Design a protein around this ligand. Structure first.
Ligand SMILES: CCCCCCCC[N+](C)(C)CCCS(=O)(=O)[O-]
Lengths: 232, 224
């Protein structure tokens, strides 16, 4: 379970998942595989006493964290490690890794939704594993590298804008059956160099259910945390 | 009213006011509604070494804060109505003044405010001496407890044939004094807008995390 949720998806496959929100009575979110045994993967929920959004992610309904800025438009996904700012003598191997960053900006072009999203993730090795990014302090990290435009050995991804349908008068994307309700928060994330390889897809299927389907190089923790950053 | 003017604006809303000047001139802030509703009054003291505005919730006289310039006249601090610690050090801590905002002019403007708690209230900054304060922290680059804001640069508009911003109808007159204050991370969330609509009338519209006293004092700092 712990190993599965951190492993990049096998090459050539799509890992298809159901994400459920529980708003009864902050809301709880759950990820399960979208089979008919529906194995539990991940739970997430916002911490109560927190100044900005902080979701704690676990494999019991503690494996990572999603942290927001105050403006609610720049996110980092961490693993379970320690924050270097809390003590400089902390063992380097125990410091938290940055698994993803997510940047939301308002669109300058019309006809592709209110928001653009950029996803920065670590690069991959020859053995198809992540090359970890494990900052020793403030001055480095995925969002900092994005801001300084130093994305050298990182992977950058964006939301796919919808395409004018040729005879039928729509800006659309083919979600391959994984959307049941139209929603401004449905999305496909792609690499700019291949618009047809859908690295992450998030689709609404009911009031509190969504599809979440991921491919290499993402793992479930990264996929889940990126989907969570899309909620208000 | 004393509560209202210190309360951060409700999240998701914009509090729309009208600022007027009686032309040392007097300044007045009203809610921008069909019936005027009074919020704040301010006036420069005549006999200060540097610029000092007193701010009240009574336009006839309820003392609520102050706006104090530095020596050069390019940096300002906004205080609530508490005591200055330099005047009496045995003074109870709960009675000492708090720093609500600071403004630095180069015009390019930098606005520094206290940060907010998990309950959406200010984390107060209440120095015991002048080794601490908004401007001290900002100049030492220790901004963890604070929020840093700047005026938004104007952009080319083809229609108008000028560098301007979309003030949404709230400006009628072009002016060097017209501004929008934003955070670096989001140029579209307008924390404070100030705009001219006549010779001695302006709009002043604020959003969370600001309260009216921070908003009005920030605007007063832009005059001289
Ligand atoms: C400079 C501090 C601003 C405080 C954060 C405000 C949060 C803004 N959002 C992302 C939660 C949305 C703004 C509210 S809206 O949608 O009504 O403009």
């Amino acid at each position: 379970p712990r190993e599965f949720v951190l492993r990049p998806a096998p090459q050539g496959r799509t890992v298809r998942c159901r994400l459920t929100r529980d708003k009864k009575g902050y809301p709880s979110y759950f990820l399960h595989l979208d089979t008919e045994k529906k194995v539990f993967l991940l739970a997430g929920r916002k911490r109560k006493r927190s100044k900005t959004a902080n979701y704690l992610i676990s494999i019991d309904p503690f494996i990572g964290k999603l942290r927001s800025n105050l403006l609610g438009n720049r996110f980092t996904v961490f693993d379970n490690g320690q924050n270097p700012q809390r003590g400089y003598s902390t063992n380097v191997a125990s410091l938290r890794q940055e698994l993803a960053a997510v940047i939301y900006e308002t669109n300058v072009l019309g006809f592709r939704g209110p928001r653009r999203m950029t996803v920065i993730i670590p690069g991959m090795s020859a053995e198809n594993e992540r090359v970890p990014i494990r900052p020793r302090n403030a001055s480095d990290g995925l969002l900092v590298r994005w801001q300084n435009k130093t994305l050298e050995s990182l992977i950058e991804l964006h939301n796919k804008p919808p395409v004018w349908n040729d005879d039928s008068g729509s800006y659309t994307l083919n979600f391959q059956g994984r959307v049941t309700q139209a929603s401004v928060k449905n999305f496909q994330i792609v690499h700019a160099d291949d618009p047809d390889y859908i690295v992450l897809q998030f689709g609404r299927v009911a009031e509190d259910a969504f599809t979440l389907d991921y491919r290499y190089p993402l793992c479930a923790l990264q996929a889940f945390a990126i989907a969570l950053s899309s909620f208000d």
